[PDB]
């Protein structure tokens, strides 16, 4: 909120704040809230360590109250009537994907997805979202990978990804399979997720490189990998990000993603507009060298 976000006024009654106020959190979050008698009461917006919106909702007696929005840097969000304690815990909470349409609506506990059914965000009317369950039995839950288990439901595809990309034989290369866009999309579009087993950089750096075909560093402490049963689509297709080939002229980029089912992972995001049936590629780099030598 440096250039948009309405800057506001407040007034004091007996040394107590009324109206708009700003408070900084321990982690650095900046809350712009509404105050009634020096306590949070009314609409509030929170911003991260920069000017980006990470929360929109309202407080009652210093506690978050009704329908609140939580925004992730990747474009996803979590929305629902909050607990009496201000926590995203209820039966009507939803994770909404970056298209602000596809959603997983259901039971959440403190922001964790316990039972999210596929749904579509049908309207907001600009306060509260309205969801409609999609036809079917598609349910999802927070299921973060370990060092050996990639997923409790390896053949259950991510529904957002499945409408956007598919795996087929690559034409502009000889790396075998490739990842292709199903639809035409503009730049900055999340297309696919890179989930996998969670291992250590020391593990990847010290083992035979032939085991590192599908390795991707997630942060300083961990590498995401799609090891050998799972490198086969018949054994794993919950996510398909590892199928995107590497190139010196990529049309996509790896990026951090907060996924309600997979947890902290990376995703594939377009660099430019991409056409239907166009192959998606990411740049060579530290965790995937160019051919040769």
Catalytic residue among 35, 47, 230, 254: 254
Give the span between the Cα atoms of 97 and 92, in whole angstroms: 16
Catalytic residue among 72, 141, 166, 284: 284
Q: For residue 227, how many other CB atoms are within 10 A of its CB? A: 18
| DSSP-assigned states of every residue in 113-137 | EEEEEEEEEEE-TTTS-EEEEPSS-
Does residue 232 carry a catalytic annotation? Answer: no
Q: Is 284 a catalytic residue?
A: yes
DSSP β-bridge partners for residue 64: 59
- Residue 36 CA: distances (Å) to CA of 20, 30, 65, 84: 9, 19, 15, 19
User: H or E stretch including 263?
Assistant: strand 263-270
Listed in sequence order, the residues at least 6 apart from 270 whose beta carbon sits closer than 8 Å to its beta carbon are 185, 186, 187, 188, 189, 191, 251, 252, 280
Task: Look up 71 and say whether it is catalytic.
Answer: no
Is residue 97 part of the annotated active site? The answer reads no
Q: Is 259 a catalytic residue?
A: no
State the Cα–Cα distance between residues 227 and 214, nearest whole angstrom: 7
In the chain, the N- to C-terminal Cα span, in Å, equals 50
Q: Which of 95, 97, 160, 242 is catalytic?
A: 242
Instruction: Point out the catalytic residue in the list 105, 140, 194, 236.
Output: 194
For the annotated binding site, the residues are 175-177, 245-246
List the binding residues for S-adenosyl-L-methionine.
175-177, 245-246
Choose, from 141, 201, 246, 288, the residue flagged as catalytic: 246
Are the C-beta atoms of residues 153 and 234 closer than 8 Å to each other? no
Residue 83 carries which DSSP code? P
Catalytic residues: 194, 242, 246, 254, 284
């Amino acid at each position: 909120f440096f250039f948009d976000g309405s800057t506001l006024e407040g007034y004091y009654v007996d040394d107590a704040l009324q109206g708009q106020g700003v408070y900084t959190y321990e982690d650095g979050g900046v809350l712009q809230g509404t105050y009634v008698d020096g306590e949070l009461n009314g609409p509030a917006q929170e911003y991260d360590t920069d000017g980006r919106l990470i929360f929109k909702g309202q407080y009652k007696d210093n506690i978050r109250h009704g329908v609140c929005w939580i925004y992730y840097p990747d474009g996803g969000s979590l929305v629902g009537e909050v607990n009496e304690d201000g926590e995203m815990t209820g039966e009507k909470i939803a994770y909404v994907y970056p298209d602000e349409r596809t959603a997983l609506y259901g039971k959440f506990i403190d922001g964790e997805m316990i039972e999210g059914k596929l749904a579509t965000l049908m309207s907001t009317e600009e306060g509260r979202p309205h969801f409609e369950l999609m036809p079917g039995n598609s349910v999802y839950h927070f299921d973060k990978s370990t060092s050996s288990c990639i997923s409790t439901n390896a053949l259950l595809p991510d529904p957002y990804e499945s409408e956007r990309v598919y795996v087929a034989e690559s034409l502009i290369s000889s790396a075998g399979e490739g990842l292709f866009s199903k639809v035409a999309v503009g730049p900055n579009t999340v297309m696919s997720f890179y989930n996998g087993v969670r291992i250590t950089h020391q593990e990847v750096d010290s083992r035979d490189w032939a085991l590192n075909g599908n390795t991707l560093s997630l942060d300083e402490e961990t590498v995401i990998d799609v090891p050998e049963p799972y490198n086969h689509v018949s054994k794993y297709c919950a996510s398909l990000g590892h199928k995107a080939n590497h190139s010196f002229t990529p049309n996509c980029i790896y990026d951090m993603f907060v996924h309600p089912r997979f947890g902290p992972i990376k995703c594939i995001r377009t660099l430019r507009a991409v056409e239907a049936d166009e192959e998606l590629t990411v740049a060579y780099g530290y965790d995937h060298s160019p051919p040769g030598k």
